[PDB]
Design a protein around this ligand. Sequence first.
Ligand SMILES: Nc1ncnc2c1ncn2[C@@H]1O[C@H](COP(=O)(O)OP(=O)(O)OP(O)(O)=S)[C@@H](O)[C@H]1O
Ligand SMILES: Nc1ncnc2c1ncn2[C@@H]1O[C@H](COP(=O)(O)OP(=O)(O)OP(O)(O)=S)[C@@H](O)[C@H]1O
Ligand SMILES: [Mg+2]
Ligand SMILES: [Mg+2]
Lengths: 408, 408
Amino acid sequence: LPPLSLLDPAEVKQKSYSPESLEAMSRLLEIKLKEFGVEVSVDSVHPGPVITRFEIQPAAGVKVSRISNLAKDLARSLAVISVRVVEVIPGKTTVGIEIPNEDRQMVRFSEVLSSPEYDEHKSTVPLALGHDIGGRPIITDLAKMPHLLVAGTTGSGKSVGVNAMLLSILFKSTPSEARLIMIDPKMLELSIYEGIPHLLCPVVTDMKEAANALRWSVAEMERRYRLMAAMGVRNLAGFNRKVKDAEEAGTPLTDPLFRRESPDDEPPQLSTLPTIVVVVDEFADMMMIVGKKVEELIARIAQKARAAGIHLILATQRPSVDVITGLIKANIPTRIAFQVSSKIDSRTILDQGGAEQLLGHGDMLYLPPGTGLPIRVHGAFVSDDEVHRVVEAWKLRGAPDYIEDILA
Amino acid sequence: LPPLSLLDPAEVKQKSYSPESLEAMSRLLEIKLKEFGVEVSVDSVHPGPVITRFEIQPAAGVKVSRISNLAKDLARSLAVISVRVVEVIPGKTTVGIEIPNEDRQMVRFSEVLSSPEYDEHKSTVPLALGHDIGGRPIITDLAKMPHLLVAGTTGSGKSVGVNAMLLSILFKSTPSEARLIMIDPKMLELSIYEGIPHLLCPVVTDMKEAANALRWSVAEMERRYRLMAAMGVRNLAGFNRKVKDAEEAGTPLTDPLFRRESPDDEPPQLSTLPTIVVVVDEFADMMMIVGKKVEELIARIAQKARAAGIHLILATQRPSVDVITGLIKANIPTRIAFQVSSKIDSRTILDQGGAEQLLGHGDMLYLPPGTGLPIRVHGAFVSDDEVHRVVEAWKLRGAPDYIEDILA
Ligand SMILES: Nc1ncnc2c1ncn2[C@@H]1O[C@H](COP(=O)(O)OP(=O)(O)OP(O)(O)=S)[C@@H](O)[C@H]1O
Ligand SMILES: Nc1ncnc2c1ncn2[C@@H]1O[C@H](COP(=O)(O)OP(=O)(O)OP(O)(O)=S)[C@@H](O)[C@H]1O
Ligand SMILES: [Mg+2]
Ligand SMILES: [Mg+2]
């Protein structure tokens, strides 16, 4: 219900990337790559808001992996700050060489959310990530992911990305449509959402309580499954349809699971269930303080919480095999990698290299479900101050409704 | 003569840094520092265009060097990208803790040059650096430096800084007022100035020719000294005064050094001498390819070229003791350090730590002459494209005038 006008306006886009300099760079590219062990010719150029992609056609034989490993050296020989090598460009035989624009224009949240893709999204938990390399809005749906793993080192834009996702939901769903459980071992990053009506419990700081929060989630998931079974529905959307039709028909449904034990008892009237999202700002700590029990709970939620409408968003600044385990990854195919420190760290999160070539400040590689190759997305910027406003707007529309059993 | 309108406009400054969040951060700071081995209390807050400085008053005893070493950990504990620790604040007993603003506003060249400090600067070689932490224009004078050393690692803003300095001169001085010798071993960064009338020779790429360029400079310096001696003047400003007064008096001076050897010979009429600037994009190579001969020439130019109106600007991306030797430093007190990789690298350039705590993208520590402490300056941004325009504007006002003896 809170107005999008609470956000900061989109900034001017004084672009101008004269075809002049673009031909020269194309020219330099071929020259510089040649000095290395690779023959190449520029096929086309695509200027964007943050980067410019120069599609190139390698000579037969040359291993594209060879170009990828030359990224550092090529950027140097070109005197540019960074270079991202795109090994394969969907639908083409060309290789991508992406180069940062001198004056990159920031991508504002208000800009992404003002897109029809978002304004008309039906999901209860859409996530407006940002703009793609051509500047087109990239709006996703957490419900279809159906879980998300997020990594990136300091200054990469992980926390801003996490806030953009929380605000995507807060701008489209009311507390009866979506509820959240936030886990933030340190105080900082997520402490500000404290109090909004969407919260199921206060921001979790204690790791043991974090563990309980996941157990509660599992319990609620199985509880929703018994409900859906008793109702003859396959998922949350179906459940909510049934309950909604019965009401509109002047015949509200009664909890088919309620067992009367006292003459006094009356079956409670069913109501639509909210989509639940569990967001962990940093779960490397959980995986360290608690351990195996945490993996177990995560792995269980990931495997079957989708139908129950319970979704996980796990973010980590420490992308190690100890934190992002194969057990965690096996049931969470959707990945988002902001800038990471090494190719090794890139593979742990994406099972692929490349996130080490990102710029930082929101720059990311998004790996949607049933996709082998990630698409580059320029994370939308949302300031802690904008977060504070929306949060205040929500604390005015409803008081906190914590359930002191979740952390118990 | 080329119009400032050739530059890009200053971008909006949607700031807003509510005193709210500033009190909280002041609050966290004391909290977080306490967790480390340091008691502290915030005395005041000064929000700026790029950073916000929180002055703090350490408890008696605690070593300010202790806070400096905690910058990394402190930034981490605060969940911010970077923290700069200012050990002493001129005229105060406080210590500075500088924190980057979420949405930093870029500082545009047009904005700095539009300041009266620049527009009314008399020097032939003023260098508009950018904005200080409070957003005030910092315009310097190369002639009073009288030489400048510049360091910074990749993506720090060294080359943008060097272009802003070259354009500072190109927007105030005509070729009869200022001439340049550009040395750029690689092609990239400085190759674009090729052809402007100000150039004394083509952009130098060969290291041996770079060596000759420096020798020519020494020769020209001594030649100007004999000229000034013969004219009874102490410096270039004085020389140019004399030659200018004589002309206005209908009596142009004659080269007092010209020795007639033929009946044919006629003493040439003197003319005002241009201020000469030698800019090396990367002299780490020179110091490596040639060696000791290059140190010697640099050391000689640095020691006595000021009066002769000849000035050096030496920039390096590889700040090692092998490159920035004490010999070089003894005669070049003015320093500019953009972000560097380590405290060691910071000491090599500033003989002090701190450049390792910079943000990059133009952020710098400027050490003016007769000063022990550097002032933070947010470098003014100038795109390669803006440089291209100004270059074209100059190539229309004058043809190249190379002296094929300088590199010979
Ligand atoms: N999408 C973005 N667009 C522009 N700047 C961004 C973006 N995301 C992040 N930044 C910059 O980085 C800051 C926020 O970074 P975070 O998202 O908190 O980074 P982090 O990866 O969580 O690591 P930290 O700094 O340790 S919190 C902002 O204040 C900006 O200055
Ligand atoms: N003063 C500045 N303001 C904003 N962005 C800047 C500034 N200086 C540098 N940048 C960014 O960095 C780029 C230029 O960096 P350079 O100044 O060439 O860096 P460098 O330190 O010389 O190292 P490179 O990238 O190896 S050339 C610009 O294209 C911008 O994207
Ligand atoms: Mg963070
Ligand atoms: Mg450079």
